[PDB]
Amino acid sequence: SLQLVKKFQKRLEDIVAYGGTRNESSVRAAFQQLLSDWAEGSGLRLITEVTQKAVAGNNVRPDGTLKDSLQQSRGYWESKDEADTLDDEIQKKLAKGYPRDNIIFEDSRLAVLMQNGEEVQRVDMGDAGALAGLLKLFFEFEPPQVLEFRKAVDHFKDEMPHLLKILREAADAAEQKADYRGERDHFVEIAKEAINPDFSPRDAREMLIQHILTGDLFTSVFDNAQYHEDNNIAQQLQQLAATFYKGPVKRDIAERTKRYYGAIQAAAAQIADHHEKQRFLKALYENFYRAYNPAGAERLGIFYTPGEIVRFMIEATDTLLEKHFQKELADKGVEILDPATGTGTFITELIDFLPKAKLEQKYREELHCNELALLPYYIANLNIEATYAQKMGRYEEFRNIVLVDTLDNTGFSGLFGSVTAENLERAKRQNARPVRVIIGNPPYRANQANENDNNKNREYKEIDRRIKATYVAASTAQKTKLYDMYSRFLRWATDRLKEDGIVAFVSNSSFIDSRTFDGFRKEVVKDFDHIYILDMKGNANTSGERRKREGGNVFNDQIKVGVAVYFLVRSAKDTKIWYHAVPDFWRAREKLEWLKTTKFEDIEFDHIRPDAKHNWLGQVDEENDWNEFLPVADKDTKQAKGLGQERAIFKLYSLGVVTNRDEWVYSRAEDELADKVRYFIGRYNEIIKLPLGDLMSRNWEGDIKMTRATIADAQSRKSYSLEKNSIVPSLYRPFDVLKMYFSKNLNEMQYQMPSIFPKGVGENVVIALSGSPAAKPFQVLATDILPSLDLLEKTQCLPFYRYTMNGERLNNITDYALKAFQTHYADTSISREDIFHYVYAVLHHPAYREKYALNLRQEFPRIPFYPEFGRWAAWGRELMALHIGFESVAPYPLKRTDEPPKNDTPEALALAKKARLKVQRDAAKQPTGAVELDGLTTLAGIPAAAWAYKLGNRSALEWVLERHKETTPKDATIREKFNTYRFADHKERVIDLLARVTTVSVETVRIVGEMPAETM
Template sequence: MSELMIEQYYTRLEKIIQYGGSRNESALRSAFEILINGYCESKNLLLINELEIKTPSGTTVIPDGTIKDALRLDWGYWESKDEYDDLNAEIKAKFAKGYPDSNILFEDSQRAVLFQGGAKVMDVSMRDAEKLDKIITRLLSYERPEIRTFREAIEQFKTDLPTILNTLRDQIAAESQRNPQFQNARDAFLTLCREAINPQVTPEDVREMMIQHILTEEIFLSVFNESQFHRENNIAGELQKVVNTFFTGTIRRNILASIENYYLVIKRTASNIVNHHEKQKFLKVLYENFYKIYNPKAADRLGVFYTPNEIVRFMIESTDHLLDKCFRKRLSDPGVHILDPATGTGTFVTELIEFIPKTQLPHKYKDEIHCNEVSILPYYIANLNIEFTYKQKMGQYAEFKNICFMDTLDHAAFSQKQYDVFSMTVENTERIKNQNNRDIFVIIGNPPYNANQMNENENNKNREYKEIDQRIKVTYIKQSTAQKTKLYDMYSRFLRWATDRLGDKNGIIAFVSNSSFIDARSYDDFREIVADEFNEIYIIDLKGNARTSGERRRREGGNIFSDKIKVGVAIYFGSLVSYGVV
């Protein structure tokens, strides 16, 4: 029994009554919320306040708390009432409104009642610590049938996917030999990728993009069921042209038949998610899990994990504060162009959309928020998340035309870079040109951490970036003659790129990345140069370096990415002020 947590709950409850003089629900429920979250932590669950959920009849209800697991699935629910209420009558009224009875706890600080599978299974006095422990434990130990079905579908997907992948690869190999229409469409898309991403992209890379596109289309449509993304987005449209040359009718039905249940389970789960933030998180979890199954070796090496929303919001709010402090501007002001150079699934841009007032958002969204992504699946998800967030806030859909399918680090020359407009989609080319011609004021994001590796593309391992690496050599590594140093890590490259992108103009860079640069001996020159290049630098060392030991490891503590990565993490802000301009 968690005696300490329950004793702390009783103490907290008494203080609220003593100091506040109130016994109503809004005053007392915070104490029980803390208690439940304490229990949740040991089971890797999380209690989230007042999330909308859709009932079987199509209406929406909002329990006081929803318990989520790591897959963003609803594990259970909690509803708090006043002790002066008739709890039995309140329970009856909630069920009449459509509140779920699959696993829900009702309490009024005196009595707790638990329903599971539609039946009342416990009814206890909350002043009995042992019984209170048992009812909370039972709430958090119950696996709803829907969760069991979802997990079983994922396990079956793991079993079936290797066969499907081999079948698709064999099919594509056959089409490469016998289908001229396929060959032409594939070669056109390959040329696009070599221009936008990496000159070393191969036909095998395009094959894997096609497979990812084929296997995830149903997932996207299930989560964002009104999306026309695969048909309307310029890059997805080009890839779909290749797929349409062979993956139709009987071939499509036969190959995907064994994982149809996986798609149905996702669709059923997604249909009950009303809150658009939860939709985004659910989609990101699906992506992370899909990629671990699709390519576990690359997922382990690359760490397919994205920035926690709390960190993103902190960075956006801090950047807005620094803009005001240094330049008397705000993120929402006209003329403040914002760029996320490695957007992943679009978290920074969606949080920007939430942060910017509705009155200024249409202009910012249309002209002054920019982002890039080099990998096909995150690019897709970022598009979906950004457009869906805008629609939820503004009440109407608008295409987001400022995301580029490109490798940011290949565009070190910015507006001087020349393009073969016949080798890329005209729209993607124009987007890149438009971004490169803009005066960027804020560069914000989470650049890749791993040395000598790009985001998701295995074949980019040990890839060099000629222009950026030369800039690092003449700045961060002044005297070094070594061909390989840690200063060619991806986050060093992105900081070099971002600093050069701002150039001699005003601006702010805000990154979260590996924290090695703070005290590693190999970064001595780096620290000296960066200190010279910026007018002000703010660094928040979040620690979490799991590669340490002993007392140092104890001081480092846990990682903000829930220990999914092993390196320490830091948030840093740098401001460049062009004197005489402000």
């Protein structure tokens, strides 16, 4: 770089000194050698005096042309004598026909770079830093072919659905030839013991369509036809493809797929750098699964890692190998394994990092890889083999890649990897290797999205037994999500590393702060000695200001889960947990540029000291007197009728009803609901009369939402019946009273609500609150109707009465509470109803919500003994009235203005009766006090203070608007048959509710503002 430019200046002065000539013919050898040597490093070469026909038919000969391996010009250079005018000589040469695409008009003193026909940079050759910049730009100019290849790769992505239609039809026409069926049956049975115990003919047709698609592009775009001929696994799958893909069958498919392969082949043939062509391998990988098996992409995980993350993770594992094991990634003995290779990005970038001197040995016996899917396996093996060929000149086959389930091959006797025989040997050799670095991007997946997908994660007996005995056992959580595919890879890693080394992984950042990952946070500090976490935020499953703070996902904003690059080193005191978080409100670009421009040494980490609840972040303050009562406790609830462990204000607590089929069980009208339920009960009754085979394999048409409970009682051949006294009113979301079918048959978990509100319709008042760990701000709302689990985040309702089995409304406020209050305030006047309203008021107190915020977020809200009591229970009698009877409060005067439709076309009216329900805001994004209800009616005159009753991340008014918008049902059956909500029929009711809730909002904001500015 700088060194070469310094040598250029040393030569120019010595040519005029030792030679005594300023003629261009002699002083040009200085720049010729500068360009020639810079080029040799960039994979190009400066050829001199190469003639070129110009447009007008004049052969022009520049002083030098930069040529690639495909003998194609990618830059030019013309030196002149300093006794002239560069600008004048540039103009004359340009007019002779000189190319302007990328040319350095050199003069012994200064040089200009005309890229794309326009001067881009003019520097002085007497500057070693300026000439280094000009030359970097000349030797990194993207030729037209590179841009036209990136256009073609993007278009191939959109045409992959259509290309896979031709190939699907082919694999279907092969199921008629008995030769194919015979071979397929042999493959399924050798892959049912090697890859997946449930390998099906459907899985085999996928591996065929992959072998065919990749065995055409590898020979056209990548020019490596030999790969398939010599690859161990490819020879096993060509034995299944040569039963049909040959002769006129192949000729027909080839002539119909050529329209989809033509453009990429044209552009790719003019590219010589494998680093540019590898973007096609990344696109085939991701888009194939998105177009063919979108479900298997979820199981396997099919997202590539941005190169910036992989290069940082490789550089940092090296700094940490030196600091702890006094070794280097290139040193012999450091065996690196990538458990989930994907496109092979980790091993390809290691090849680039390791020097050419050691690469050979590293490549033959130290870098190892594993993959479960064929298309990723083929793409990786080719990527790795071609990165070595470009760097080290010669081509050597990579013999360290195995097609095996990393978590199943835990034989450190199985037939895992027995797809072929060389594969099985590679698997057994890898198990014995002394691995020291386990680098990679583990697949992340906690659960399936809906029960109707039948795409549950596979079970791995050995690994899962290890997790239960380690991470889950140490956890005190009710729900364990430690069986995520990423925590399974984290267990395997801690076990594969048998002695000392690093496990550098990029994964979901729930481990740092999630209740389920309490046991991991306890066990990982025993297994490792130095843990270095680097939070890259990105959680898009959040909302409101949190969403804004999270920012963009370092994965090019393609995923919605939080991401952290962590390095867990075990050498051989206490575990040092170091932590650094990326700045808030950053975009994905800013986060990826930081990773590219930062070194591990420069990063300033913070020593996390785990608390006794094994929390690393979010540790609460202890200087508080937060030990002040307790609204509810798990012990008070599970108290065995002794009134001895009744140490909370309320005894029983319950979560709101979860149905697991909200679209089938809730409706704004009773008639619509009865009809929706009728279809369900009807279709279920047709399912319970099916062959046991279909019942056990869940082989039924999924037109109804079948959840765990239903599937269980449909295999038990139980029969459901419509009980019509189950349609009860229920607060679904704040200020949204829908109707629900309260049946234990169609509701998954009713929790302890059949005791709070018996049979759905019962007399009780519940102070609903947010549960822990909350992400949305603390929210508390009293209801007299059955709540939902999502009225507030993880809604935990605290009732005033409690109905025993066929019994009375036993007061739920405990006597310990009553006695304690009647003691501190010393007035036996205090009754349970006063305490109910006292608790509500304290929970609405702004300063309590601010001071004990981190406490409220991780525990049940403990209640202070505020001085007055009378004033507090009064404030809370007003608050609860407004909230419960929001359907009866005085309507605030709101000015309704109405506009006529644009024209008189029947469609204008229809399009203008569609709901918009949007808060008209100003340029400062602050409400202007108007709401565009629909294209015609617009209500106005809302006070600014009414926008401050924020129940969650949304204000009370914004909640009413949102839950009355015409949103398409996610379920298909309901979208097609039971979608009959038109805002037109509910417009007048909404005009009334918005007005009533405006009063609730302004009244609440006032009462909350009258409350003191300090918390006991």
